[PDB]
Every structure is written in structure tokens, then in C-alpha cells.
């Protein structure tokens, strides 16, 4: 087999775009072929079946959040407050691009065989949970953060961004209220980072 660079990525971005433009978390392989211009066999070649493509889409979309959690424990010169503000900003940027991400995670947990559903849930419900827990714990011990459950905190950040971007996209698509301007999204990220930080910061 002779590799064709870019093809796998095109299939994943096309699936993403269909979902995002459609306010859905499902695609047909026939619409994927029509929109990408690539034939049926390529999905099977790269991903095996639709479940494989969706799992690869989830893996891809989650990369920046996973990296942001790993950066929490990096030896840089950033305070715990600065590091957390950056992690929340990354999550938000991710849901702007992939607002369907929580729903995609849920359907794959729901529909996969048990062993696979467990691997997905264990990986992505709270990404790199040992790192996340250690960062929050450290911050509590240092008097920077009030005691909080990291899983709940992550649900709060990601739930909030999902709500906002999903709503704004639905309104854009229904009423042609293109509102997701750079000025609005920056206002959103700032307000939301501030709210979430106020939620966690001690005293």
C-alpha cells in the first residue's frame, strides 16, 4: 500500500465540519464521501467502519485538552493561577472548534463494547486525571485554590463552553445571526475564565 498524505485528516475534518454545520453528532458515510470527494473504501481503509472514524475524530479533537492538562505540571515559571487560566482557555478554544465533543464522547461510551467504552471513559471523562488531581491538590495545599472536585470542575468548564458555542451555532444556522466574531469570542473566553477562576480561588 502506497500512502496518500492528507487523506485521513481530510476525512476527519469533513466529518467534523458536517457535525458542526449541521448541529448534529452523527454523519453518514455517503455524506462524508460527497462532501470530502473521497470514496467509500477510504473510510474503511483508514478507520474500518463508522465507529472507527468517530473514535479517531474523538482522539483528534481531544489532543489539545489532553496537552493542556499535561502542561499543568510543567516546570515553567507560571503560577498555579496562570497555569489554570491557560487550561480553561484551551478547553474553550476546543469547544469553539468542536462543540459536539461531549456528546461525541457520550455516544461512543454508550455504544461501544464494554471494554472499549471503559478505555474511552477512563481516558477522557477527566483527561490525564492523575495529573489533574495532583495540580489541583498542590494548589489547595499552597492556599491558592479552595477544595474542589477536579472532575466537577472540568465538567463545569466544558459544559459551559459546550452550551455557549452550541447555542450560538444553532442560532447562527436558524436565524443567520452570525455572532461568533473575534470580539465576541474573546469577550466570552475572558468572562468565562474570570467566572471559573472566581469559583476556585481561595479567599
Q: How many other C-beta atoms lie within 10 A of the C-beta of residue 34?
A: 12
Residues of span 98-117 touching a second copy by CB under 8 A: 102-103, 106-107, 109-110, 114, 117
Q: Could you say whether residue 149 binds Cl ion (CB under 5 A)?
A: yes
Q: Could you say whether residue 158 binds a second copy (CB under 8 A)?
A: yes
Q: Could you say whether residue 152 binds a second copy (CB under 8 A)?
A: yes
What would the DSSP string read from start to end of 72-115? HT--SS--HHHHHHHHHHHHHHHHHH-TTHHHHHHHHHHHS-HH
Q: Could you say whether residue 202 binds Cl ion (CB under 5 A)?
A: no
CB 129 within 8 Å of CB 141: no
Distance of CA 77 to the CA centre of its chain: 27
Q: Which stretch binds a second copy (CB under 8 A): 35-43, 74-82, 83-91, 145-153?
A: 145-153
Q: Which stretch binds a second copy (CB under 8 A): 3-11, 30-38, 83-91, 153-161?
A: 153-161
Decide: residue 176, CB within 10 A, 0-12 exposed, 13-18 middle, 19+ buried: exposed
The binding site for a second copy (CB under 8 A) comprises 23, 102-103, 106-107, 109-110, 114, 117-118, 121, 125, 146, 148-149, 152-153, 155-156, 158-164, 166-167, 170-171, 173-175, 188, 191-192, 195-196, 198-200
Amino acid at each position: 500500500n502506497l500512502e496518500t498524505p492528507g487523506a485521513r485528516d481530510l476525512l476527519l475534518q469533513t466529518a467534523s465540519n458536517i457535525m458542526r454545520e449541521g448541529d448534529v453528532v452523527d454523519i453518514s458515510l455517503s455524506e462524508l464521501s460527497l462532501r470530502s470527494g473521497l470514496n467509500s473504501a477510504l473510510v474503511k481503509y483508514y478507520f474500518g467502519n463508522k465507529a472507527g472514524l468517530l473514535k479517531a475524530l474523538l482522539d483528534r479533537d481531544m489532543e489539545n485538552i489532553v496537552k493542556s492538562v499535561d502542561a499543568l505540571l510543567a516546570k515553567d515559571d507560571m503560577s498555579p493561577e496562570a497555569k489554570l487560566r491557560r487550561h480553561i482557555s484551551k478547553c474553550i478554544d476546543t469547544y469553539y472548534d468542536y462543540p459536539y465533543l461531549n456528546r461525541l464522547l457520550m455516544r461512543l461510551v454508550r455504544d461501544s463494547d464494554e471494554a472499549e467504552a471503559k478505555r474511552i471513559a477512563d481516558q477522557y471523562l477527566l483527561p490525564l486525571h492523575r495529573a489533574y488531581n495532583r495540580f489541583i491538590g498542590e494548589g489547595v495545599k499552597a492556599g491558592v485554590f479552595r477544595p474542589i472536585n477536579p472532575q466537577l470542575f472540568y465538567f463545569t468548564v466544558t459544559g459551559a463552553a459546550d452550551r455557549f458555542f452550541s447555542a450560538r451555532l444553532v442560532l447562527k444556522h436558524c436565524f443567520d445571526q452570525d455572532t461568533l466574531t473575534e470580539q465576541l469570542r474573546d469577550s466570552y473566553r475572558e468572562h468565562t475564565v474570570d467566572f471559573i477562576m472566581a469559583g476556585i480561588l481561595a479567599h
